[PDB]
From Swiss-Prot:
Function (record text): May be involved in transcriptional regulation. Overexpression causes down-regulation of a number of genes involved in the immune response. Some genes are also up-regulated.
Compartments where located: Nucleus; Cytoplasm, Cytosol
Annotated protein name in UniProt: Zinc finger protein ZFAT
Residues reported in the UniProt entry to bind Zn(2+) 7: C12, C15, H28, H33
Tissues with expression: Isoform 1 is strongly expressed in placenta, spleen, kidney, testis and peripheral blood leukocytes. Expressed in CD4+ and CD8+ T-cells, CD19+ B-cells and CB14+ monocytes. Isoform 3 is strongly expressed in placenta, ovary, tonsil, CD19+ B-cells and CD14+ monocytes.
Top-rank taxon: Eukaryota
Start and end residues, zinc fingers (C2H2-type): 10-33
Amino acid sequence: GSSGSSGHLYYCSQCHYSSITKNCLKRHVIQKHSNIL
Ligand SMILES: [Zn+2]
């Protein structure tokens, strides 16, 4: 047998969250974090 990490997801700019595409992930950054400089 064998072992390893899970399939690819795009990771958040400010936490450990991840999603399918940047087009979904940006909504998490808009809603859950301070999306400012
Ligand atoms: Zn996040």
